[PDB]
Ligand binder design. Structure first.
Ligand SMILES: COC(=O)[C@H]1C[C@H](OCCN)[C@@H](O[C@H]2O[C@H](CO)[C@@H](O)[C@H](O)[C@@H]2O)C[C@@H]1C(=O)OC
Ligand code: CA
Ligand code: CA
Ligand code: CA
Ligand code: CL
Ligand code: CL
Ligand code: CL
Length: 131
């Protein structure tokens, strides 16, 4: 189950770290085009792994998490709620909704809420067995 050219493997999934930039909704579409999903994080170690990729590349990167539907209620693009323990991953002072910020990104060593219509890099996730 190797990952394809210029994907990244971790714990049985393949991740695509984009080299172009898209707004949040277009990032969701780009992942669906390749049979993947704008990344939904399911564990601490997956968070630590993805956060470090984004931190060391100095790339502000979308993940599949928003509070577009109900301000302050964050939910992943697969419909799962943000668990309270995962709220540890917000950067200090986030989420702050400054000017209305409804989409989550990796920013430095944790997460930031930012404007969904900003173009950022993105990460898709797909099982390695499905390639
Ligand atoms: C509409 O929001 C703004 O005018 C500002 C708010 C923040 O200014 C504080 C000085 N850094 C900036 O917002 C960025 O950084 C924040 C963390 O410091 C973060 O929570 C925000 O999501 C955003 O990434 C700058 C911002 C602005 O309009 O200028 C870029
Ligand atoms: Ca809002
Ligand atoms: Ca918000
Ligand atoms: Ca913010
Ligand atoms: Cl790309
Ligand atoms: Cl593109
Ligand atoms: Cl999706």
């Amino acid at each position: 189950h190797p990952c394809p050219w210029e994907w990244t493997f971790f714990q049985g999934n393949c991740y695509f770290m984009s080299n172009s930039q898209r707004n949040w909704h277009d990032s969701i579409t780009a992942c669906k085009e390749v049979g993947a999903q704008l990344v939904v994080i399911k564990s601490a170690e997956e968070q630590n792994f993805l956060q470090l990729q984004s931190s060391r590349s100095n790339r502000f990167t979308w993940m599949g998490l928003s509070d577009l539907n109900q301000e302050g209620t964050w939910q992943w693009v697969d419909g799962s709620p943000l668990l309270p323990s995962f709220k540890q991953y917000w950067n200090r002072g986030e989420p702050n909704n400054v000017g209305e910020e409804d989409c989550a990104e990796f920013s430095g060593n944790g997460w930031n809420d930012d404007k969904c219509n900003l173009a950022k890099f993105w990460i898709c996730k797909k099982s390695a067995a499905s390639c």
